[PDB]
Structure 1
Amino acid sequence: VSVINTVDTSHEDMIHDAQMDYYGIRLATCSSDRSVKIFDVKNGGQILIADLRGHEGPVWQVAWAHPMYGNILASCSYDRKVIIWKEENGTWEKTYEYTGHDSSVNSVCWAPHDFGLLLACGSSDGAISILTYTGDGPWEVKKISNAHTIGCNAVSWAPSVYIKRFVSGGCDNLVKIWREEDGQWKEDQKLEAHSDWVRDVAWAPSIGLPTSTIASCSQDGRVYIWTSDDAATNCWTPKLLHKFNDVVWHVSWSITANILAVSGGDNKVTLWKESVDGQWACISDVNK
């Protein structure tokens, strides 16, 4: 509601996505100008600290890693290259470049620090690659082939509760949850409710709750809320939030109070919070 410092990005195109760090001192930003820029916003002062240009095509997503492993920043892209940057003594350098995909990599999401330094990459070839840094040596790659028939749009890991699980949504109209069994990523659930392409899926960071909640926005506009009271049962119940007329793009949960931020093609952000009785109600409308 209140207006703090407004940043000047010195960019040349539409910033497709952004993401702040764990402690809220920095902001990564990615645009269609093949450039990932790092901004140090401290005490209301916009300071461009780094400009990382290593892609051949547009950059779609940027994800910060947990503080304990250092300042690790992942950036996916259209050029089938997942570039992992790392800050050493104030200098950002490319440490690893995974080029094992046939089409555009659309999403990157780090695993909870408990599991390790795992990164999931969803690409338009219908494949999810799991990169793993063991501390010593290179990155072990586990590629889940034919995950989605057409392509994979978004990936998001479950809060650590340790059974490693992550949810992925694709253009095949199906939201799929994955689970690591015996060291192998196997398909766990198939949630079907959308009539069109799933654009983004994000697993709620459930705090003090037995229930697990996942949100999924789609092309048709219907935002569904998937809830499973018991993790063992794996019975997921969907609940329509609101059918937006314009294509909903991505969904994001708040860390502390689980408030969903929904953005549609109408250039507006609608905040939704579940009430005690159960009905979801919009609390504010923050348009561009």
Structure 2
Amino acid sequence: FVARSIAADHKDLIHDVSFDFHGRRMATCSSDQSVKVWDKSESGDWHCTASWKTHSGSVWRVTWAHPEFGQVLASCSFDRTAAVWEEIVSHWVKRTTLVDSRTSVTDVKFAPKHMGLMLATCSADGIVRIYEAPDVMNLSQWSLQHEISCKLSCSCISWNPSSSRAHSPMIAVGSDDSSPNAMAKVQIFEYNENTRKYAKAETLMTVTDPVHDIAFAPNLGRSFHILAIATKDVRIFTLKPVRKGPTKFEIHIVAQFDNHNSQVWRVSWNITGTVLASSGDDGCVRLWKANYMDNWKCTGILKG
């Protein structure tokens, strides 16, 4: 549709942009070790309302939390740390700092609201950790609960946003290392209510080129799961549980598009889980949709 420019005033590259739960605030992070927060006025113009130095290295990702716990943000950096910020009555203060990593921390993600207040982080050494805050009234007491260990270097993580009581929690983690061999780059871990531990569930064998981002889809009504991957091309998968250890899935493939003729960097679904947006090296954003015959077309080409 219509495109309007924003004056970021960042001294280096921007690595992430995130919206909030009510859709009227936005956060941007850059390699000048800074974080900015933007607000939208009645006239429909975005203007900055805060900016403060956050880490001592490049900041990769920044994410919001549910408004039930307050106005909370999380960040990850090249200096092997993760921080939690809150807004009190207006400046932002630091609440915690997680320093267990030995290498650069690459992604950070908040858990869906019905599990509580949980956070998951991923490193370049192949270790994924899950934290928790047992008492919401103190946002400075986190406690480590689980620790998974993959065989390769992680680059992205994603939670399952389903809210059903027949689905157990699961998280998908992807790699980015380029090796002369041919090993699977995407793995899925599932929770076991009986043994109280995360266990391996499936492995996406077909994916062999390096991965850059993955994203589940907002369920809202269904009995199966949809996953999107941003490799050299765009791929979309489907996982449907089988009737009743880890649950058994039937993995298929439903879409593959090489329309970018480049490397795909980012993917993003929408609020209803029906339209997929992808960005590539050419510099264009593309939109994908599916009809009632389960074919995935294109819907628009947005160019900057």
Q: TM-score, normalised by structure 1?
A: 0.92
Aligned residue number for residue 142 of structure 1: 145
Please identify, of 172-181 and 246-255, the stretch whose mean Cα deviation from structure 2 is larger.
Answer: 172-181
Q: Which amino acid aligns with 1:94?
A: K
Secondary structure of 1:114's aligned partner: helix
Flag structure 2 segments of 5+ consecutive residues without an equivalent: 177-182
Change (3 A) 1:175 1:230: same
The answer to whether 1:264 aligns with 2:264 is: no
Gaps of 5+ in 1: none
Q: Is the 8 A contact 2:126 2:153 kept in 1?
A: yes
CA shift for structure 1 position 236: 1.6
Q: Match for residue 27 of structure 1?
A: 26
Q: Distance in 2 between matches of 1:187 and 1:257?
A: 26
What letter matches 1:215 in structure 2?
A
Please list, as runs of the form range in 1=range in 2, the aligned pairs for 1:78-157 lying within 5 A after superposition: 78-135=78-135, 138-147=141-150, 149-157=151-159
Q: Which residue of 1 aligns with 2:249?
A: 234
**CA shift for structure 1 position 143:** 4.8
Distance 1:121 1:265 in 2: 27
Structure 1 stretch displaced more, 234-243 or 119-128:
234-243
| Structure 2 residue 188 is matched with structure 1 residue 177 | yes
Q: What is the match of residue 219 of structure 2? A: 206
3-state SS of 1:256 partner = coil
C-alpha distance in structure 2 between counterparts of 1:262 and 1:125, whole Å: 28
Aligned equivalents of 1:35, 1:173: Cα separation in 2 = 35
Q: Percent identity?
A: 33
CA distance in 2, matches of 1:143, 1:245: 40
SS for the counterpart of 2:15 is strand
Q: Distance in 1 between matches of 2:267 and 2:164?
A: 22
Which residue pairs with 2:235 in the alignment?
224
Moved more, 186-195 or 23-32: 186-195
Amino acid corresponding to residue 46 of structure 1 in structure 2 = W
Equivalent positions of 1:53-64 (< 5 A) are 53-64=53-64
Matching of residues 244-259 of structure 1 within 5 Å: 244-259=260-275
Q: Cα deviation per residue 1:124-170 (whole Å; 9 max; x = unaligned)?
A: 111111111111572111353432x3311111110222422111111
Q: Name the residue aligned to 2:171.
A: 166
Deviation per CA, 1:239-281: give whole Å up to 9, x if none.
3421242111121111124211111111111111112111111
Moved more, 245-254 or 131-140: 131-140
2:107 touches 2:123 (CA, 8 Å); kept in 1?
A: yes
Normalising by structure 2, we get a TM-score of 0.88
Corresponding position of 2:35 = 36
- Asked if the contact 2:80–2:102 (Cα under 8 Å) also holds between the matched residues in 1, the reply is yes
Q: Which has the larger radius of gyration?
A: 2
Number of equivalenced pairs: 284
Distance 2:88 2:206 in 1: 46
The alignment partner of 1:22 has SS state of: coil
Measure how far apart 1:6 and its partner are.
3.6
2:301 equivalent to 1:285: yes
TM-superposed deviation, 1:53: 1.3
Which amino acid in 2 is paired with 1:165?
A: M
- The SS at the match of 1:153 is strand
SS state at 2:218 partner? coil
Query: After TM superposition, which residue ranges in structure 1, 4 or more long, deviate above 4 angstroms?
Result: none
Q: Deviations over 1:6-36 (max 9, x none)?
A: 4322211221110010001210001111111
The question of whether the paired residues in 1 share the 8 Å contact of 2:17 and 2:27 is answered with yes
Q: Cα RMSD between the aligned structures? A: 1.8
CA contact (8 A) 1:39 1:47 kept: yes
Q: Cα offset for 1:204?
A: 0.5
Amino acid at match of 2:173: S
- Contact kept, 8 Å, 2:218 with 2:273, in 1: the verdict is no
